[PDB]
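Supplementary Methods S3. Input chains for the assembly prediction are listed below.
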Amino acid sequence: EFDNVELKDLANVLSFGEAKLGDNGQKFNFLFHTASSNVWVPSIKCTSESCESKNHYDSSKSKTYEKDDTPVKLTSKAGTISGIFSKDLVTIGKLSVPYKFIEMTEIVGFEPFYSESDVDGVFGLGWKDLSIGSIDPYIVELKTQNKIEQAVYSIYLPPENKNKGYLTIGGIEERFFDGPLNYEKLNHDLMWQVDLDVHFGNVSSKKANVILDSATSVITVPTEFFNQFVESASVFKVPFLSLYVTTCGNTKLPTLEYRSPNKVYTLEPKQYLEPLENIFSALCMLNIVPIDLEKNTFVLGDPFMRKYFTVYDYDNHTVGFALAKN
Amino acid sequence: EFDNVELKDLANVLSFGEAKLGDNGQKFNFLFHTASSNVWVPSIKCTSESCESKNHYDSSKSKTYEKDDTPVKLTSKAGTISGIFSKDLVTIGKLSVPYKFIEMTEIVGFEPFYSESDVDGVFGLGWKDLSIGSIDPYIVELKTQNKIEQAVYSIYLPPENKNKGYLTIGGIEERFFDGPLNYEKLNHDLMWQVDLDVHFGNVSSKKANVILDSATSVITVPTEFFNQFVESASVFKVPFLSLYVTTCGNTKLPTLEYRSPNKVYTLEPKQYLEPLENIFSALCMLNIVPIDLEKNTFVLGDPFMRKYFTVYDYDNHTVGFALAKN
Ligand SMILES: Cc1cccc(C)c1OCC(=O)N[C@@H](Cc1ccccc1)[C@H](O)C(=O)N1CSC(C)(C)[C@H]1C(=O)N[C@H]1c2ccccc2C[C@H]1O
Ligand SMILES: Cc1cccc(C)c1OCC(=O)N[C@@H](Cc1ccccc1)[C@H](O)C(=O)N1CSC(C)(C)[C@H]1C(=O)N[C@H]1c2ccccc2C[C@H]1O
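Predicted structure tokens for the full assembly:
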């Protein structure tokens, strides 16, 4: 069949899994991130309080380590992180190829996400042009090395939450989905991003840049677009910190439509609302958030990926969509 | 009368206010923090993305600047921040005295709190032994310079939320409170901290170290203590991110008792629960959080300070409590 990796759930984002580095197979907990293109791991030299309880990579204990040592210093407001490049075996299931990754020397910030969960680093699965160092993506490298037949991968997330998810490499596994598998052309080879027309209420946006992101637990929508949606949709702002809140059985809330020239992709209130209560419960949390990334940009996260099984095809520069089984 | 400063509300913590540095009176938004003992401000040399939209301090533009230049580098997992000491005029209302503060050269992390709100830095109002540099507290310096009669200050927070609060320096303003003003001995001259016996349900902790902290929007309780409290109190854990949730009219939840050898300080469910709904609302958010600071340590934040007007007396090493008016 095809190679798997169980996706474990953490802060309501379902895309953490295990991969292994080195000839001695050091394990690491990773965020598999379709919206970035490098793999990051804590080095043994990392003297940051944050690295202290994570897994480290020791180049001196793997026979297949190749020195690189190009420095890197990624810095946002959120935190700073710096280290060096190394080449070694990177392994998922039966799949192994020398890959260049970043040994993290110093990491500050990204709290509390980082130190509190048990993720060690992130494993990007985006496009070459989005990487530091301009490095062919792992799956693409797997293909070049005649280890898999197609540079393709899929993410399955269970319609019924509680369960585990799967990242599959090198083929489409028929068991995960129902009906036909629709493809859409990428508008850029950066992130996995596609042109769609998006209608919410009577509020709509044509030729929107919509991005598939596993690291997101939520549905993203431009600020202007979100305000129109909520205004006269009987959704209520309240909080200490955002939300927002509505009735679970609210027959006012619309279906979310993402239309391509072939197929329309829909999200029912049932799939973008979250139960707040255990005693009750008529009361629900709206999984749609106002976020401005880039002129006209929507993010599809877990809520969407939990309905739709998604196929990421490096060979054809397309994204596949199907209704998820189980 | 006595010198004021309006407390502005930000992320449901009500203790942001304005003070001025230099002879040219450069304004800054400050977190007035009773649990720390330095004043921090963004320098003009700060090249961090985070400083970009804050107010800066320019020593070259104030006639009363005195060079110091002792370096500082405070570093947690949360973020890193580094700068140098300067002496200049620090002004709140009619009150002005040369004070040593920290010009921040570099600041990474503390996201998203910092860059998203409009606070520039923090103005500590704790005890000497808690500072970097071992520097007499601002109000204590104000006294030494014969600018105020007692090194004392008070924090008033409106019972009814929406309104503004006040930090008052050098006297007790009778209008803010009702009834008698009770004093408690500090157990240490570090933070404003006091020995009390704390009873929640039948769950209780004797000779607890309880800390007054304005920067906290919440009531803090040791983990073991919190678990006992919630177990069989019909409070429910649910979330993406904590909470917890209960009925607003829940006649099970106990009164919170903080007893000293003279006076018992109480918190009713009404004062430690927060409405989640606007349509409805029977449904409430519990403002008490499990946090382990130090063996037997409780934090009293806004929910408590909104009932009790609090006096901070440097001269007598005491904390005053009274039922807040208005
Ligand atoms: C943390 C880290 C460790 C090792 C190595 C790297 C590169 C790391 O990333 C630092 C960084 O610059 N991350 C970028 C994303 C990025 C990574 C790599 C290259 C380019 C960009 C961004 O600032 C960021 O944190 N984002 C962007 S969107 C997002 C809200 C999903 C979030 C995220 O990653 N995670 C979210 C999440 C996921 C699960 C649970 C909770 C949360 C909260 C939130 O933080
Ligand atoms: C932020 C900053 C800017 C400039 C300069 C300085 C010194 C700054 O302080 C960073 C720091 O080391 N803060 C220390 C306190 C401190 C300050 C100075 C010297 C020594 C210790 C502490 O660990 C801390 O962040 N705490 C203690 S408990 C807490 C969770 C309330 C939190 C806090 O402050 N704020 C919370 C809050 C409040 C409102 C809204 C959101 C949030 C999230 C959370 O961060």
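The domain at 175-326 of chain A is CATH 2.40.70.10 (Cathepsin D, subunit A; domain 1). DSSP finds five helices and 23 strands in chain A.
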